[PDB]
From Swiss-Prot, chain B:
It comes from Homo sapiens. It is an enzyme of class 3 (hydrolase). The record marks R131, Y152 as: Involved in allosteric regulation. GO terms for biological process: apoptotic process; cellular response to lipopolysaccharide; cellular response to staurosporine; defense response to bacterium; execution phase of apoptosis; fibroblast apoptotic process; heart development; lymphocyte apoptotic process. Changing Y152 to A/F/W/D/E: Does not significantly affect thiol protease catalytic efficiency. Belongs to the peptidase C14A family. Highly expressed in lung, skeletal muscle, liver, kidney, spleen and heart, and moderately in testis. No expression in the brain. The modification Phosphothreonine is found at T117. The chain holds residues 57 to 302 of 303 of the full protein. The exosite polybasic region mediates non-specific RNA-binding, acting as a bridge for RNA-binding target proteins, such as PARP1. The exosite is also required for interaction with non-RNA-binding proteins, such as Hsp90 co-chaperone PTGES3. Its main location: cytoplasm. This is Caspase-7. During activation, the N-terminal disordered prodomain is removed by cleavage. Concomitantly, double cleavage gives rise to a large Caspase-7 subunit p20 and a small Caspase-7 subunit p11. The two large and two small subunits then assemble to form the active CASP7 complex. Can be cleaved and activated by different caspases, depending on the context. Cleaved and activated by initiator caspases (CASP8, CASP9 and/or CASP10), leading to execution phase of apoptosis. Inhibited by XIAP, which directly binds to the active site pocket and obstructs substrate entry.
Length: 5, 231
């Protein structure tokens, strides 16, 4: 959730 | 004399590829926050004077076909061209919803020998995607490849951070700087200020110490031969 690509 | 000619009917076309949802076979989660990014981008680039079209959840074949057709259009009355890629990524490669495709294969369609109507005109590519798996811990006749510019969200090998609630760092910084100075600054000044903003204003927060207090620095690759203003 709360993270990158 | 040292600037790109902006004396055309239209500024140009801006293609925004917003990949949020991905096939299960790719094993990648939903890119929450990318819609905020895409909308902000659409407004900023519309404000600059672009004719912006947003495509969502595209496949590799779809992205290739898109940029192909765009390369085959008539940009005679266009000052420039712009493409934005919002997706998952690895080094030299970007994700469609089906899988992966090489970025160079996306941008090659607009090469001088392939897109004659954009000859001597700037081709801009903004890529919000990861370029590897490494982390920043921080500390306290004319060439066919000419007139290209790539604005990557991060340096090769490193991650590109994205806040599900606020959007990705690079895109939101870029959008702010474009809101304020998009028309009175040269493109490299803008992207430099974007570098500064992303570098300083951001520090990741996570319960996993592996992703706690981490940093990011964007990357600009310029093959431009003139200065670029959007006015």
């Amino acid at each position: 959730x709360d993270x990158x690509x | 004399t040292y600037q790109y000619n902006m004396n055309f009917e239209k500024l140009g076309k801006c293609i925004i590829i917003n990949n949020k949802n991905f096939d299960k076979v790719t094993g990648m989660g939903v890119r929450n926050g990318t819609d905020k990014d895409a909308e902000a981008l659409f407004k900023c680039f519309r404000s600059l004077g672009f004719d912006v079209i947003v495509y969502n959840d595209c496949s590799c074949a779809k992205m290739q076909d898109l940029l192909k057709k765009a390369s085959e259009e008539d940009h005679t009355n266009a000052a420039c061209f712009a493409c934005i890629l919002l997706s998952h990524g690895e080094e030299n490669v970007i994700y469609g919803k089906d899988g992966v495709t090489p970025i160079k294969d996306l941008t090659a369609h607009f090469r001088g020998d392939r897109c004659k109507t954009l000859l001597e005109k700037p081709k801009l590519f903004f890529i919000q995607a990861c370029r590897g798996t490494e982390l920043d811990d921080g500390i306290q006749k004319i060439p066919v490849e000419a007139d290209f510019l790539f604005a990557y969200s991060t340096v090769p090998g490193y991650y590109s951070w994205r806040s599900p609630g606020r959007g990705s760092w690079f895109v939101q910084a870029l959008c702010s700087i474009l809101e304020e100075h998009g028309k009175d600054l040269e493109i490299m000044q803008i992207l430099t200020r974007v570098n500064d903003r992303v570098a300083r204003h951001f520090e990741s927060q996570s319960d996993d110490p592996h992703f706690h207090e981490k940093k990011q620095i964007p990357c600009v690759v310029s093959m431009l031969t003139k200065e670029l203003y959007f006015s």
